[PDB]
Amino acid sequence: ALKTFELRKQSQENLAEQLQELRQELASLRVQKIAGGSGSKLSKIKTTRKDIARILTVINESNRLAAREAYKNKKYIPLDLRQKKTRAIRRALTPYEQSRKTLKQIKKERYFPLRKYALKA
Amino acid sequence: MKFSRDVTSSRRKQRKAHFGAPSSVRRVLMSAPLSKELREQYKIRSLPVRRDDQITVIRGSNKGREGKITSVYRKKFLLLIERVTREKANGASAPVGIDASKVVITKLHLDKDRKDLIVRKGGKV
Amino acid sequence: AVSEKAGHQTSAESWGTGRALARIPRVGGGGTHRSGQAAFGNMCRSGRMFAPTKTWRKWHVKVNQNEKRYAIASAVAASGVPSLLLARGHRIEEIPEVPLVVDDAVQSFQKTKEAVALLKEIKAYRDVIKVANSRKLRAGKGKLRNRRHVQRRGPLVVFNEDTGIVKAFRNIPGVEIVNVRRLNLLQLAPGGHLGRFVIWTKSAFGLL
Amino acid sequence: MRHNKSHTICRRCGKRSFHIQKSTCACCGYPAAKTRSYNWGAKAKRRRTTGTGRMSYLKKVHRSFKNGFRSGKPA
Amino acid sequence: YVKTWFNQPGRKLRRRQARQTKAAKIAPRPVEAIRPAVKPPTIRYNMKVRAGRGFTLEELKAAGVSRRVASTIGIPVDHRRRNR
Amino acid sequence: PSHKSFRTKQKLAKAARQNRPIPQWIRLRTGNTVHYNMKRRHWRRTKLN
RNA sequence: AAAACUUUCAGCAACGGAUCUCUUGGCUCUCGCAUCGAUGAAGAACGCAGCGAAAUGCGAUACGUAAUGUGAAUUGCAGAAGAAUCAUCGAAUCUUUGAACGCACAUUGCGCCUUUGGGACCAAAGGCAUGCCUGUUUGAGUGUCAU
RNA sequence: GCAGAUCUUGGUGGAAGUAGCAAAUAUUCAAAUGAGAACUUUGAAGACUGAAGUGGGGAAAGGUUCCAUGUGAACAGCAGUUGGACAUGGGUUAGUCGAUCCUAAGAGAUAGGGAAGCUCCGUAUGAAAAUCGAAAGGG
RNA sequence: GUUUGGGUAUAGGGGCGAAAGACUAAUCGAACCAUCUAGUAGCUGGUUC
RNA sequence: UUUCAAUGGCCCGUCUACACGGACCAAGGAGUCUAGCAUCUAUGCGAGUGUUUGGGUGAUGAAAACCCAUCCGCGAA
RNA sequence: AUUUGACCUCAAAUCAGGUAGGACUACGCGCUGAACUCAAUAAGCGCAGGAAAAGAAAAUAACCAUGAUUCCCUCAGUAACGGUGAAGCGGGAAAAGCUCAAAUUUGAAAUCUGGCAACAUUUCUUUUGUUGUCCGAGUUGUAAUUUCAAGAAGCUGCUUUGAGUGUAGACGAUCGGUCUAAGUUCCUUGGAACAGGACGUCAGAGAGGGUGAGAACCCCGUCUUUGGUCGAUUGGAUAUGCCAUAUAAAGCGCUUUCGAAGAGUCGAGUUGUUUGCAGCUCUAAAUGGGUGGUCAUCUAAAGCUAAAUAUUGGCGAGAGACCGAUAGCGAACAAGUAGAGUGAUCGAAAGAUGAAAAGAACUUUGAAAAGAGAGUUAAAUAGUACGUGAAAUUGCUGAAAGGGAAGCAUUGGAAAUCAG
Ligand SMILES: [Zn+2]
User: Fold this and answer.
1) Residue F39 in contact with residue F18, Cβ under 8 Å?
2) Domains in chain F: boundaries
3) Shortest Cα distance from D2 to chain A (angstroms)?
4) I want to staple C126 with a disulfide (CB 3.0 to 4.6 A). Which of A51, B85, C91, C122 is the partner?
5) Alpha-carbon distance B74 to B72, whole Å?
6) ∠ at Cα C171 (C167, C175), nearest 5°?
7) F12 nearest nucleotide via C1' and CA
8) What are the beta bridge partners of residue B56?
9) Which residue of A113, A118, A119 is in closest CB contact with E72?
10) Which positions in strand G are less than 7 Å from the protein's CB atoms?
11) Residue F36, CB, less than 7 Å from strand K?
């Protein structure tokens, strides 16, 4: 099968053409199965299916990194590019606004913080 | 006796883990000891069993038979050895299976990965 | 305890009187093997057992502290008598002295070889072999229930300070090591039988 | 004389419990937004509760949680 | 409804570990704060002395330590109690 | 009848595939208790409902 | 008054599945942890393997792909031969539905907006639910006013 | 620790090769297949349903029972070479036939009004404007 | 010598009924289903060497 | 052990003779756990008695065991 | 006339950006609520979390006074009510306090969301921010100071100070990677040694599991491990570097000062629910109001907050004086499956060949199915209808008895058999 890394160092159109010829080959392999083929062809059906899956994977990755580059350093980005941990974590308070304190509390923690002490036994 | 709490001692859990271990774990479970010359040559007591290894049977009805391994038939914790077969009713050859722990490895199949294993497991090449 | 819902999560009501059959409730429905069969009864198949076992049975029992201390003191006194040890079953025919006292030099042991050498040299190793030879396969459902093997009991080594004695002795079959300040009755007189063979150290004996 | 239907296959729960005239499923309560459930039907709850299906997302979340919900690509 | 106590050794072990974790976290300082000597408020127990919640403002001022820094150095303060 | 909807036909289609005999090779596998079919239905017998 | 028949006893053979032994199951107790969903949840449907009906897994990239670790398999046959029904898992895909969201759904029914492609028509991609909040734009008011 | 509880579950008996077998007049001869023919196939003969059919079609309902090939383990209160059973395959082709479109009885979203609330009234209603419902109706 | 197919409406001490104290999925001492419920027992039948 | 001869022998359980159950066999199957109170017995201590609400130690499995402490319970009117 | 611009109110948008639904429910908070004290239970409805709720006194007390909440022992089965049934105190587990409204910054809205542009930072190209500019919000009040424990305004002279940004080592922890001591030596039995006997070894490892029977030394593991070795994260401190801007802020002792404090709310009458709450008539005060018997104690009608506590659900584990296939979950198995009902729902049965299919080649009879010879195996008294294989019941063989019962007991003969 095609190696994923050398699939990555190619351009969009070549992967598109490789995708197209793979589909021709898969269609040819399946009609051999219907009309009667050898075990090599029946086993080749699976490996060519996986190789199209590899090409779809690398194409989608290249598109998504391209989109992330386009939306890099922006306030709003597509919901697919946004993180998805849980709905609760997304709705929760961020650490910055959990650490926000009034100036009254800032003065209190400036002047009377939790001191470092000890007792002699 | 075990003193930790991360490990189990229940017969139920040990058998479930043993007979449900995936192929990667059955590789370690299907280990065999080395011969005296091999042990003194690599400073290794036991090694995992791999195909195309030259082994000799130590226990069973084939005690003393010697040959290479044709396959480590993992999903039954079983080995298959060249010429260690059985005559069926018709006369065909049915391979006689031997447990991995009942044989001794008299000659290894050296590649870079196995040499890495030897030097990693407190051994010398 | 059994499940509190065991035998109840079916659906079965009594068919009534005059049915030419017993009045125990029977599962409703039809077309299935269970329909028409009885339920809700200790006699009935797949029914709740009589008085289902409960978790708040009295499992633990309170013993007066003075009674516990009385038993432990008597257990130590029993261990200091040769005849009770022979009845206990300890092979102490050639033990030089009972009670057996050993110097503090054994509280800093490091190897099972050293511990076994001491046991042979005091001639207490007959008891260890008796324990080792007595290892058997348990009779009954115990081995199904995580009680696979059964053996005897060997010498009880009582120490004062753990500097390596516990680890150097813990692997000899039958040898049980305990601190002098936490003498357990279950180890001093196991099985309710008095007079275990106990090996003391000097510091533990002085602290007794 | 028995050649009519009272219930049909439900869209939401795939059972033949969706009434025709009432147009409400007797099993799951569709088209109600809330799934029909009743505490007296403990067995009825456990026949249709979570875990009787694929749980495809929940297994994804659990494996993700076990590692602190990290994202990106390792070295 | 029954409340069984089969987790009593488990609770005891967990509390001890929590004390151990607390000690490890704030090791420089004692794990228990200073507590005032206080007399129970009844005719049956007015002959004893036990540990009160915290000191009062008058006691803090008489000692010379301010109510602000008293919390910082580990002296609990009770604003309800008064010295009669 | 001869006026079934698509959903009815599709449900019928898989119900016809479910009651088919089991291939022998899956039986011949090891550790495979499957040796017959316990979901075999017949049209004259129990209805699909 | 012999056979046959009936009954009793014993051996053997049947019928049946008790007993004994086991057990990747159940039950109970204890300890640890806090993690669903409009970025589409739980659930349902329909499909996916060379030879599969169920179970499991997965979603037209379909008994899966990417990445990391292991290091030479899978196996019932055939088959070729960084393999594998391996583990981990942070990158992706995820069909029809479902709170289900263009209108409906006992219907593979009926639409509208934007763009593109094909040799008016068709196809493809992206969109069109409700309530509420902050802001933006346009307004409506013989509501109050200033020129 | 069981002899009972019209006990539970499972297994097995005597009655007993006993009661009995289905309505719907009725079958016979020859040949072929076949291990095996009262029951399969062809011919000949005799009958029956007698257009209000034992005829040819459809709706509801069933769902592959349809057709070919093969089998005779199990089912067809006899039998079977046959079957609607089993096994392997094949088979439903629409601009004009229907659904889809419209609406009837009826159901019901929305704007508003109630209810502690899931939600009920309201649908032409005091709003800054529907939909579903007929494989026998209309087309 | 009115009947009836389909669609729809009416649901439980309710509906429906030219009224039989009738029908309401082979059930109407009072529809069916699941919980409370392991309901209530002066009573019956069994209760093991 | 089978069998014969003589003698004897009504079918068991339940319920107040009758009646009710019983075709046969195997397995299951019915005074249990718990809270309080009372008598008696035994054990420990004794004008005292009760560790396990709690704390400490316990490494070898640590839900056990061992140790420690003020209330408080009953009793001492 | 009427045109222009404001403010107020209300609309519309497939406007820009967000949010709510549904599911689980063991534990948690409310509403509602029966029947046979039942029971503030079950059912029904709403809503959360890892805990929830409660919580810093409009609290107890009558003391030498205690001092937020929660939980446990005790109070105590006491007070109280007519069987129900507390609380104060006392001993413990855990501890942590606070934030607003009510007063002018008036020499300066000093405050904040959003748009635009850069700078950054990340569990992360996925996160979170900084600055500048514009518009908007906002004087019908956003900032700073104040919360009654006080506090403000003067006066005083002592003390204190960052909501920062890199580098290194140590100290922990999470994830997975990887490391581990010794017989397979001899003889007998056996299909197989993992059994018995002999000779030995390791043990900080003699727990457990697998392997052709009871394996510490064949293998996995186990002890070492509260650790060595890899990597990736971080949490907090130490050393070290760089920015900050204090012309300030804060604590403490005095007052020659004032001290703002929550309304259809408290409260009363009436009806309803188990003092507490709600409906309704009516409706307050400012040394006032609430609570307890003039006194004592609190300061409501506004808000936040870890910990000890619960946890038949979910996810991981460790166990057991539990059950051992009519038992234990309904389900050890293709189980909420087959199947039943229009539906709500109801819901089983069924584990074991052998070490290894080695699953009986081949021949013969038979239409076939099968049988008989063989063959595999230690075993076919293991042939899948497969471990062991009981009873009821049935067939055959052998022995015996029998004229409308049979069973049983006592004595002895006859036959069979065993024994001293
Ligand atoms: Zn439904």
Assistant:
1) yes
2) 1-49
3) 46
4) C91
5) 5
6) 95
7) H63
8) B66, B104
9) A113
10) 21-25, 27-32, 35-47, 49-54, 57-59, 61-80, 82-87, 89-94, 97-100, 105-108
11) yes
d(CA B115, CA D1): 82
The number of C-alpha atoms within 13 Å of C169 and in the hemisphere containing its C-beta is 26
Instruction: Write the DSSP assignment of chain C as a string of letters.
Output: ---TTTTTSS-EE---SSSSS--S-EE--SSSTTTT-B-SSSSSTT-PPSS---TTS-------HHHHHHHHHHHHHHHT-HHHHHHHT---TT-S-SSEEE-GGGTT---HHHHHHHHHHTT-HHHHHHHHHT-EEPSSTTGGGT--EE-----EEEESS-SSHHHHHTTSTT-EEEEGGG--HHHHSGGG-----EEEEHHHHHH-
Question: Which of these, D31, D36, D33, D39, lies nearest to D11 by C-alpha position?
Answer: D31
C52/C42 Cα distance (integer angstroms): 10
The alpha carbon of C80 is separated from its chain's Cα centroid by a whole number of angstroms, namely 24
Q: Going by C-beta distance under 8 Å and a sequence separation of 6 or more, which residues neighbour residue B58?
A: B102, B103, B104
A12-35 and A39-70 are packed helices; what angle lies between their axes, rounded to 10 degrees?
160
**Distance (Å, rounded) from C-alpha D75 to C-alpha D73?**
7
Report the C-alpha gap between B124 and B39 in whole angstroms.
11
CB B40 within 8 A of CB B116: no
Closest-approach nucleotide to residue F29, Cα vs C1': G76
Beta-carbon contacts below 8 Å between D and F:
3
A-chain CB neighbours of D69 within 8 Å are 85-86, 89
Q: Residue E29: closest CA among chain A residues belongs to which residue?
A: A118
Name the nearest CA neighbour of B62 among B77, B84, B81.
B84
Confirm if B125 and B110 have CB atoms less than 8 A apart. no
B95 strand-pairing partners = B85
The answer to whether residue C113 neighbours chain B at the CB level (below 8 Å) is no
For E82, residues 6+ apart whose C-beta sits below 8 A from its C-beta are E56, E58
Is D63 near strand I, with its CB below 7 A from some atom of it? no
DSSP H helices, A9-113, are: 12-35, 39-70, 87-91, 95-98, 103-111
Rounded to the nearest whole angstrom, what is the distance from the C-alpha of residue D41 to the centroid of ligand 1? Answer: 16
- Specify the amino acid at residue C108: S
Q: Within 7 A of a protein CB, which nucleotides of strand I?
A: 5-10, 25, 33-35, 37-38
The number of CA neighbours under 13 Å toward the Cβ of F19 is 12
Residue A30 tokens, joined? 């399946």
Q: Could you state, in order of their start, the residue ranges of all structural domains in chain A? A: 1-75, 76-121
Chains B and D touch (3+ CB pairs under 8 A): no
By what technique were these coordinates determined?
A: cryo-EM
- C141-168 burial, b for 16+ CB within 10 Å, e for fewer? eeeeeeeeeeebbbbbbbbbeeebbeeb
Distance from C-alpha of C43 to C-alpha of C23, rounded to nearest angstrom: 13
E interface with A, Cβ–Cβ < 8 A, is: 28-30, 68-69, 71-74
